[PDB]
Symmetry: D2
Amino acid sequence: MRKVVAEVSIIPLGKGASVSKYVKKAIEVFKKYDLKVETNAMGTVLEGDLDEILKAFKEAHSTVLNDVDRVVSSLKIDERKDKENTIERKLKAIGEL
Amino acid sequence: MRKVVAEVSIIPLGKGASVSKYVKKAIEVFKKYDLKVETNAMGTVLEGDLDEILKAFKEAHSTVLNDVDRVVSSLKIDERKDKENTIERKLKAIGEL
Amino acid sequence: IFMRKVVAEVSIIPLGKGASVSKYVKKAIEVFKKYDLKVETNAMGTVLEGDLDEILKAFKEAHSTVLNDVDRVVSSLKIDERKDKENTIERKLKAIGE
Amino acid sequence: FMRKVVAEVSIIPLGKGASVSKYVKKAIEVFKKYDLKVETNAMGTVLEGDLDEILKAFKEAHSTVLNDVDRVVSSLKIDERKDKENTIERKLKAIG
């Protein structure tokens, strides 16, 4: 287990401004993995194994691409080896929990 | 009032992995403006006038830079003309409210 | 005083109908050329060098120009600023041996 | 089975003294070990090649830099389309 905190956004192009079903489809993929999932208005934060996050990201990106012609997906990872890599700690450290 | 939804992250390249202090300074800066501020584990989501968000972004970036030698800040704007640009609608649209 | 130099990268994603957005990407780039900035376009975004306020204004105009033709646009601006060294594309690339 | 995509990556180490060029250079050397076209710019590195290879390269680059510091924030952005080839060349030509 190599825990990290990440943020992902899967954006489909060519379908117009209303793409909520695609964003929802991606979130469903993340939930299939052993990850804590916190969705916000601009993306989804994930907490879990680095490899699992990488697999989930690829699957989320691919599942949306299956229904559209083009997708721009972003993955940001924040990992430190001196403290626990969790969403709770991160939030508590800045008074957002 | 040209409302948009955005996500920002201000990362200082000074001290080690310890930078929660700077993250908090930025959040407080945003809250001085007439913006809805929703912070998550990987950044802060903002809702409000575009010009106000740009101003806030610059100040937040600057306030953190005042204490360190280098800062890498990110601003992502999501704006549409067919529906209201609110955090509430975005979350409701994907069933995450 | 009239120059607070930084290096930045901008990418604009239009969410419209049809497969291809190069037309809008091109439009945004043309906007950058109206400001006193060094412009280095790559396959995933555009790198800019110049005054922070000018980059912010250029960013807003680029985003707005594309939004003029589509219903929704997701635009990204990343700023890299340091006070211990010069903020230029040149120094960044030479430092990397590129 | 090739699945070509274009991506951009930035590996940013936290806590070492504003100057992190040696770490950025290290990440770049890692990308070069993969069969990917590598085009570095002042704010990141653009990659072209197989998706899995890019994901692996991203992981290894992030990990290599993390080996020398306490914290690293790495970003990966993928742009993939099914209606046209996924090359840096085409993307650049399409926009002049």
